Symmetry: D3
Subunit: 150 residues, 6 copies
Amino acid sequence: VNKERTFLAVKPDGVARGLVGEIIARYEKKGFVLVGLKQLVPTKDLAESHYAEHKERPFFGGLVSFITSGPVVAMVFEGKGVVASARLMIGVTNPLASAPGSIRGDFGVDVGRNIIHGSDSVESANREIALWFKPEELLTEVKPNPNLYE
Amino acid sequence: VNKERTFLAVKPDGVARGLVGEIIARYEKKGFVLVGLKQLVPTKDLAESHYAEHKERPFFGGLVSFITSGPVVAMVFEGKGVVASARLMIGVTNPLASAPGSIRGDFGVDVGRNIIHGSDSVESANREIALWFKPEELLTEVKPNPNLYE
Amino acid sequence: VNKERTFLAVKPDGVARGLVGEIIARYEKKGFVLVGLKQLVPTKDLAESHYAEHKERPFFGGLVSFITSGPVVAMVFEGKGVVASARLMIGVTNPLASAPGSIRGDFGVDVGRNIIHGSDSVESANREIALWFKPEELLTEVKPNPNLYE
Amino acid sequence: VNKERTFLAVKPDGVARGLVGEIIARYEKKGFVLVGLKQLVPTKDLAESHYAEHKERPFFGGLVSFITSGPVVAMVFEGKGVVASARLMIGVTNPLASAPGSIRGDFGVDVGRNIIHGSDSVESANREIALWFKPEELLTEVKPNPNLYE
Amino acid sequence: VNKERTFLAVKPDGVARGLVGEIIARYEKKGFVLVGLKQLVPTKDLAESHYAEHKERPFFGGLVSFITSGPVVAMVFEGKGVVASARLMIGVTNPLASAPGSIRGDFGVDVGRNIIHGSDSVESANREIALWFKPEELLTEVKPNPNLYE
Amino acid sequence: VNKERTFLAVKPDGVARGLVGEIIARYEKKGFVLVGLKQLVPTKDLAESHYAEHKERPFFGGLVSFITSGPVVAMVFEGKGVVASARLMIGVTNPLASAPGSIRGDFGVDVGRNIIHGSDSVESANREIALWFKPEELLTEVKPNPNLYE
Ligand SMILES: Nc1ncnc2c1ncn2[C@@H]1O[C@H](COP(=O)(O)OP(=O)(O)O)[C@@H](O)[C@H]1O
Ligand SMILES: Nc1ncnc2c1ncn2[C@@H]1O[C@H](COP(=O)(O)OP(=O)(O)O)[C@@H](O)[C@H]1O
Ligand SMILES: Nc1ncnc2c1ncn2[C@@H]1O[C@H](COP(=O)(O)OP(=O)(O)O)[C@@H](O)[C@H]1O
Ligand SMILES: Nc1ncnc2c1ncn2[C@@H]1O[C@H](COP(=O)(O)OP(=O)(O)O)[C@@H](O)[C@H]1O
Ligand SMILES: Nc1ncnc2c1ncn2[C@@H]1O[C@H](COP(=O)(O)OP(=O)(O)O)[C@@H](O)[C@H]1O
Ligand SMILES: Nc1ncnc2c1ncn2[C@@H]1O[C@H](COP(=O)(O)OP(=O)(O)O)[C@@H](O)[C@H]1O
Ligand SMILES: [Mg+2]
Ligand SMILES: [Mg+2]
Ligand SMILES: [Mg+2]
């Protein structure tokens, strides 16, 4: 619509590296509205339900261990085309091949340490949102700048 | 002392102007650790307890009315002297009198729209953390860059 | 040549969003020289002469109404390949498909609210320049850093 | 008071060092509104009236000679206490004595090359706006983020 | 490996333009470790050995004259895929065709004045490193953040 | 006076936290010229001479032990009043008491981890430059933006 939402998670590395404010600000600058925000230490269950599509990927184990190893900053951003757009702002999986100006392109080197998670579709955003936030955690009242939308 | 915590709140005006990342980043850069973080629309009750000291003052009402009017991003940072330091980083009540480089100095013009709330003392930080955050919402084991403290 | 000029206009949204300084600075950083600069509220005539190529596009009406709805910051930048280069710095029409690091890519979401106008050719730059600035408004004396040009 | 205006001038040195965006952005960020903006090479006459208070001083000549030597970016910002605030944001006469975070503190080293001019009072701002700007060059209806003032 | 190194040189222009801190910081942000750093005025011999592959290119003479015309900030950065990655962060030869967010894309206009040199392969990095630094100038002790590498 | 020089050292903590570019940039922006720059792991002997004034103090040992523990980025900047100015830009001994906008104010929390060393006087700058730098490592002919000094 224009009320599309995405699930973004600043991974433990990213939190550790003090990149939280920097990530949020990129999205705030873009004109996306923060409709949900929290810091938590993901549980094994959440992590596994989160990355369930990767269940049989050789890095799963490590992935799940790492995401649960420290605080994660989870958030939901709402705005027109926010899913595909947050995905672009992030870069690609490998932070080395990520274009400069992208979050990963500017701050990571290693795949295992690629700082942020972003939902890759409306479907998965919807699913991840529900997984990480209770609807009472999410705003109903959205108001970005009127200067953003026609 | 390295464990000291402060209660910081990005007010509805800070949130609508898109200064959340920007603010977190400042504290992140300073070396303070994020032990608690969430976005919520405060409650008249929270709002009133939170501003209890000002109940006999003329702006009390506006204060409470304002705070409850939109999303707030509440957070607690931990670190050596964080209470006094975050105050200095914020500026003074009046943004116009607040020095450039401070949060208020840099982004605010009006007292009732001074973007952020910072605990003014350990006692108050302690009271305010409790008030706004559930124990399970705060990190227990905090890991700050080891380059920060001796 | 190397004395090529382009017409850039920070649209009402962009002005409203306080992105003026930020846009200028990108161009100053790049090494382009500001040879003309002003803030004005475009008239219907200017707007229509400006976007005349779009006269029969379904959004014309809206375009013209919006550009005239508030202050515009018009400017001319001079430098080698400034037209094509300012165009790259801007992104594409849709700020959503605009690469991160581009003005539109970093700050817009909506096409109707894509913050800046940049001439798309030497021809059109020449025409827009003449349309928006009297030659007395334009510098004759250009001096970028000697550190920029061989 | 919310309507108060100040006269700011980015001097020839500020302009050549590419600090125009950078400076506008600071004021933009503060929440001040841009009611007047233009680039011009000052006139000896303008220059002298503008610096009239210093005509009996030794540096008067240099001052006028300097100001008239290249492009200046003149602007008027409106907002509550903007005159005093923009002064604070600028620093003191001597850049070296100006605190980090201020314009002079951050970018200047020498008094005769102190980048910017800011009106020191309402009377002076009023005199200087008139002097440098044509009434039709200033906005009449100013719209500041509504998140700025109570 | 992950201990790969690259030779980066901030050219005289770039030094002149005060872009040194800005370049370094991009690399520090990325997570690369500075294992060697110095400011020197390259000699004709160094310059020619450096750009030996270009010996018969029409710009060689000019290239060599320019690199020797002022201080160069030479440095070595270590990290996974640092060669290809530093090359991406730089842009392409022509700063005009360089993507926004890239060093050249953000700061240059002219090919002759494209601010930085980056080795283009492991081979050439190895060779340039040895050419510009004595092994006593290079760290042996590498420690980037553990937050960077899996 | 325009020729004045200062000794600045980015300490092992400044270096590990990736604040080298960030720090150089500040000084670069101010208009100070980089006359000497290198990365080295200090020597107990250097370290002790350098901190000679504090040999009768309790933290002397820690100081020397700390300094020698990792890479330091030593640099000398030249410019009018640079000694006093760079001090102001650094903050006070205690980062927590250092004002926002200053280096310590912005990035440090602890006295023993206060990121940078700046010469406190001409005599000391002169002594410290000599100590840390070889004459041939310092520029002889310094060219500062001509927009900086009158
Ligand atoms: N080859 C790998 N080795 C280690 N971790 C990996 C690898 N591939 C992916 N990952 C991790 O798995 C996460 C999920 O993988 P993927 O869906 O492919 O990435 P993305 O986050 O780009 O969508 C990545 O962000 C990263 O944290
Ligand atoms: N006189 C006033 N008028 C309007 N709002 C006020 C006034 N005094 C305080 N406030 C508001 O209420 C808050 C009250 O806290 P106070 O202790 O006075 O300030 P601070 O936040 O700097 O500690 C202020 O930050 C501001 O939002
Ligand atoms: N489909 C659209 N809906 C609304 N506004 C549009 C649309 N397409 C273009 N615009 C507006 O018209 C301006 C001119 O259009 P166009 O030439 O295609 O864009 P550009 O500014 O990228 O060159 C755009 O910048 C935008 O402000
Ligand atoms: N003693 C001086 N030497 C050189 N230039 C000076 C001197 N005093 C003032 N100036 C210059 O003229 C301006 C005069 O205005 P003044 O009221 O003294 O300072 P300010 O701009 O801070 O209000 C200064 O900003 C500076 O450019
Ligand atoms: N056509 C040219 N005119 C002038 N200088 C050039 C030209 N092509 C290259 N250079 C200079 O030669 C350097 C080496 O050239 P090249 O290997 O092609 O560039 P790069 O630095 O992108 O690898 C460039 O960075 C630039 O400083
Ligand atoms: N009381 C202390 N405890 C720990 N470290 C200290 C103490 N006093 C000084 N230092 C350390 O040694 C340096 C000594 O220099 P000093 O003259 O006291 O400070 P400054 O660096 O601000 O000039 C400090 O910057 C800091 O790293
Ligand atoms: Mg994926
Ligand atoms: Mg077009
Ligand atoms: Mg090459």
